[PDB]
Symmetry: C2
Subunit: 105 residues, 2 copies
């Protein structure tokens, strides 16, 4: 099914840096989005990522959806990844460091 570019333009895709990560199947993240401030995300990225690995990792997120609660944790942004098989995620990242809050287009 063909998509509308104006729907893409409604999305706010940003770069942010992971500043905290914790696991108690998801990882709770806090992420620095620059002028947008700090935001939380819950990400089902336990297949490949250990919370230690992630501090200072730059990610790509959609920042302007309504929040959702995952096991009580407020997830405010949707962190984007490729899914080559069910349960598996590889994070997207910029190829070079960018300023936090950089817009994607």
């Amino acid at each position: 099914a063909m998509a509308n570019f104006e729907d893409f333009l409604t999305l706010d895709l940003r770069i942010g840096t992971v500043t905290h990560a914790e696991e108690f199947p998801a990882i709770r993240l806090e992420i620095d989005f620059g002028e947008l401030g700090m935001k939380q995300s819950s990400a089902q990225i336990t297949k490949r990522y250990n919370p230690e690995d992630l501090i200072g990792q730059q990610i790509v997120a959609v920042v302007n959806f309504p929040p959702k609660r995952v096991a009580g944790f407020k997830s405010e942004v949707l962190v984007l990844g490729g899914v080559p098989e069910a349960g598996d995620v590889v994070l997207l990242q910029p190829n070079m460091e960018l300023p936090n809050g950089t817009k994607i287009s």
Copy 2:
């Protein structure tokens, strides 16, 4: 302004690998013309205004992220079939998105 998740679900974002790249002028703007392998979707062509930070040589074999289900974009005879995504920290400056680890071409993004 707040976006609807259902609208996001209409988009088809995919990983592809650049197999060929050439510097050219798109409507008198320096750009790189890319041929990109999207796995099950096959080969697609795109133009990207990425000359600030990229040269054709170092793009070959690189994996990128693109939206593949928009109508094609045409500029001055050049059809772009996918939108290659990048961060734009200032005018003229593009840093490409990439997967953090290797993925099969055509892998879907969510």
